[PDB]
Amino acid sequence: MKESLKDRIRLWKRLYVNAFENALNAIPNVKGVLLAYNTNIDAIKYLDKDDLEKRVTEIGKEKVFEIIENPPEKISSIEELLGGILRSIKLGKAMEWFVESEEVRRYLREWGWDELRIGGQAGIMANLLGGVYRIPTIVHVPQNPKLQAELFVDGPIYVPVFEGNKLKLVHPKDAIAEEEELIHYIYEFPRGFQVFDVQAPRENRFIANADDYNARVYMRREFREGFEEITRNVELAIISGLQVLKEYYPDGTTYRDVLDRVESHLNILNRYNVKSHFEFAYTANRRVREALVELLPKFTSVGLNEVELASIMEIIGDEELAKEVLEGHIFSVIDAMNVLMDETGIERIHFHTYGYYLALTQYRGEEVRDALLFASLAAAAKAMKGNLERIEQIRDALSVPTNERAIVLEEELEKEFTEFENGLIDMVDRQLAFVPTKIVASPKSTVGIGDTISSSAFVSEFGMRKR
């Protein structure tokens, strides 16, 4: 007879338990992951009403409110900084503007922060894969002054240093350098935060970006001259941070100054049979977005969400498919994943959205689904606790109810794409895996989650499949 809704609920609970056990057994098999390129410092301030109003008044209230109506491209004055914050509160929208002015950068440091944590997709994933999962990790740190180095947690996290010719791997706190602090000031505000007449529709953040190095992808000399020797020490690589690249720069350089070098790294990784996963974050420039699609055949794997997959369909699908993917309509998402895998021949695509994940793979097996389940629990644990510290904290995410609507979506999906096992579907020359996720009702954290999902699935899948 058909498995009822209450039966599929029990069945997903058992799959989640077994997948957590299998991931914990498999993860010790991973002998190294490389993470590149973006690592910075995040300085978080929880905005205060009086303090923010006083600063708007000091600088000139008429100049600030004008900036909310006509926003600039980047921050070049204190008026523009505080205009962007109030616009972010008014619209309720996640914004990030680059700080060009040295005077504003001094003003931001004096205003300060309530909390400091590692930033950047590579930097955050070093603390997760190295600190929590204990996988030996080499991370790219474009500028490593003391304030940056000491944001890394204890565990097997490593950065390359040159001893004349010989490359060594040491903890980041053992490699402090006289280098720039790359700080992103994150001004956070709750649901219905109010300042003057302006009031927030929902909770969000404005980011003031004072980081010259990750914006242009300037790489350490150890990754420029010693990449092959780094490669010899890992089995996996996760590449992120290319989404900032512009087609043209005012100094006449272009995006290929960085992408030719990235491609040279991929050539090395593939010569050593390292499996690589690209985080295809939204890339505003369409010519750069297309050059990154054309680099996908040299990756093993790609991670993307509904905005990021819709964006890629705008350049290689069609606009109507892109619209449907943006909304997370499962059959259009599948069609899009298939179009991307037909265009690139990439072996793995992991899609993640609100309620469910999909993974389309050229190879077959239950490990693909169990890695998705582990990633779901890692994400729910991070959102629950704010930041994770040990891998046993992810066990508590087993208590978070699985999203019941996505259990029902599984039926709809299965009527067209028959399953051979729960969450697992054969196609002619590929496999599709589906899991319903764990949505945390009152999350302590809303940032770093997408990377947590995408990294955790890729690394635990490899660990489980390794033979």
Side-chain angles (χ1 to χ4, degrees):
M1 63 183 273
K2 86 142 169 140
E3 297 159 330
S4 76
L5 180 51
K6 280 188 168 165
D7 283 343
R8 277 209 313 287
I9 291 163
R10 285 179 216 99
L11 185 151
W12 282 109
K13 278 178 202 174
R14 157 165 157 95
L15 292 179
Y16 261 109
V17 161
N18 290 168
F20 182 62
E21 299 305 322
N22 290 348
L24 290 179
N25 297 337
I27 272 166
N29 298 340
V30 184
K31 313 304 193 204
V33 59
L34 175 60
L35 305 173
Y37 297 93
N38 54 333
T39 293
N40 58 272
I41 292 161
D42 279 350
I44 302 153
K45 184 181 282 292
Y46 302 107
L47 290 162
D48 171 75
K49 191 199 85 193
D50 300 331
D51 165 55
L52 180 61
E53 287 179 1
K54 187 190 179 194
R55 292 180 174 271
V56 178
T57 314
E58 281 181 348
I59 202 76
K61 195 186 168 179
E62 64 287 305
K63 286 155 157 69
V64 169
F65 274 83
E66 198 277 323
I67 297 301
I68 306 167
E69 306 304 316
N70 292 53
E73 60 290 328
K74 60 184 186 170
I75 299 157
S76 163
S77 68
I78 303 155
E79 294 87 333
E80 291 174 334
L81 160 61
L82 298 176
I85 298 159
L86 298 192
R87 180 173 162 90
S88 171
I89 296 154
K90 194 176 163 180
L91 282 62
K93 191 197 182 185
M95 288 146 71
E96 173 174 350
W97 290 2
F98 183 75
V99 187
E100 186 73 65
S101 164
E102 289 274 52
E103 194 183 297
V104 179
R105 285 183 182 192
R106 292 188 289 268
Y107 182 102
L108 296 163
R109 170 183 343 284
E110 303 226 359
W111 192 8
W113 51 79
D114 298 311
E115 273 174 19
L116 214 64
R117 67 185 179 190
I118 194 92
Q121 294 161 279
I124 295 169
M125 286 311 96
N127 277 352
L128 179 70
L129 301 179
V132 179
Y133 300 168
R134 321 304 286 184
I135 296 169
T137 293
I138 308 173
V139 56
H140 181 72
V141 188
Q143 291 285 275
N144 195 32
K146 179 176 192 281
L147 199 59
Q148 170 77 78
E150 284 179 348
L151 285 169
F152 286 99
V153 294
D154 297 312
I157 305 169
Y158 302 99
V159 291
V161 294
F162 272 131
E163 187 172 290
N165 276 342
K166 308 167 291 301
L167 183 144
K168 306 284 178 200
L169 289 173
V170 302
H171 304 296
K173 71 173 295 161
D174 300 330
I176 293 166
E178 306 183 342
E179 280 180 354
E180 302 178 54
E181 284 173 5
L182 293 185
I183 300 174
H184 296 198
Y185 290 89
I186 303 179
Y187 300 99
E188 287 188 24
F189 52 86
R191 202 95 51 192
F193 180 77
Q194 202 181 149
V195 51
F196 294 102
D197 46 62
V198 176
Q199 199 172 153
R202 78 283 281 180
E203 60 154 24
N204 224 323
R205 61 202 70 202
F206 177 86
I207 295 168
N209 187 320
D211 163 3
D212 307 310
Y213 282 72
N214 289 295
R216 283 264 194 143
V217 201
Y218 294 136
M219 299 181 190
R220 289 212 72 87
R221 73 171 177 128
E222 287 82 4
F223 276 69
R224 292 160 63 90
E225 299 161 35
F227 194 77
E228 172 162 1
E229 184 68 30
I230 301 161
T231 300
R232 295 170 66 182
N233 288 274
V234 298
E235 284 185 316
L236 296 175
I238 298 175
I239 307 298
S240 60
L242 308 186
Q243 67 269 22
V244 302
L245 295 169
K246 292 177 200 276
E247 193 181 0
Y248 294 117
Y249 290 89
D251 65 359
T253 50
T254 61
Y255 77 96
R256 302 225 116 276
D257 297 329
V258 172
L259 282 199
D260 292 335
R261 177 68 68 158
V262 172
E263 183 168 358
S264 178
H265 294 166
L266 282 174
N267 286 347
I268 296 157
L269 295 176
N270 279 336
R271 286 194 290 264
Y272 281 86
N273 200 41
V274 168
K275 303 311 177 182
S276 55
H277 177 77
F278 185 53
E279 303 294 29
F280 206 136
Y282 172 73
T283 304
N285 197 91
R286 292 177 77 266
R287 183 70 199 80
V288 174
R289 191 182 321 145
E290 176 59 42
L292 291 175
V293 172
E294 293 170 356
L295 210 41
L296 288 178
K298 297 180 163 195
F299 281 99
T300 312
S301 174
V302 63
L304 31 69
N305 65 20
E306 69 298 316
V307 169
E308 290 158 356
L309 180 58
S311 185
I312 294 159
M313 291 299 110
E314 299 266 36
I315 58 157
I316 65 164
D318 52 83
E319 192 168 51
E320 205 176 346
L321 183 62
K323 291 173 189 164
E324 303 164 356
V325 171
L326 192 54
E327 308 293 303
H329 292 146
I330 202 159
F331 296 106
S332 295
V333 170
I334 296 163
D335 279 354
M337 289 178 80
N338 281 308
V339 166
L340 183 58
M341 181 161 294
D342 289 346
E343 289 274 292
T344 61
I346 199 165
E347 287 163 63
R348 176 175 181 279
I349 300 172
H350 174 187
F351 174 89
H352 58 88
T353 193
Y354 162 79
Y356 68 97
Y357 309 157
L358 290 177
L360 185 69
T361 54
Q362 292 194 41
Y363 44 88
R364 303 189 186 272
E366 291 79 355
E367 294 86 4
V368 181
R369 165 193 79 193
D370 289 3
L372 297 179
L373 292 167
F374 178 66
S376 169
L377 294 171
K382 181 182 184 64
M384 272 175 80
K385 312 288 182 180
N387 220 132
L388 311 166
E389 304 205 341
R390 349 174 259 297
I391 201 168
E392 276 299 310
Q393 286 175 300
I394 299 166
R395 192 179 292 273
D396 291 350
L398 293 166
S399 295
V400 175
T402 298
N403 158 22
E404 191 185 282
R405 309 197 67 80
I407 295 169
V408 167
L409 186 55
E410 191 188 8
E411 259 312 300
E412 167 182 28
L413 164 64
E414 220 254 299
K415 298 274 212 307
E416 304 271 0
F417 288 86
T418 322
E419 282 179 338
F420 65 90
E421 272 161 42
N422 296 104
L424 291 162
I425 295 161
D426 285 329
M427 283 166 207
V428 176
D429 59 1
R430 52 198 72 160
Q431 180 181 274
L432 180 68
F434 166 88
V435 300
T437 58
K438 297 178 170 300
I439 297 163
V440 167
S442 280
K444 287 187 174 193
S445 166
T446 53
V447 145
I449 306 292
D451 298 292
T452 292
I453 290 163
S454 200
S455 307
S456 296
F458 178 65
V459 139
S460 63
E461 189 192 294
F462 175 77
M464 284 183 306
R465 291 187 66 248
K466 198 187 158 169
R467 51 178 276 272

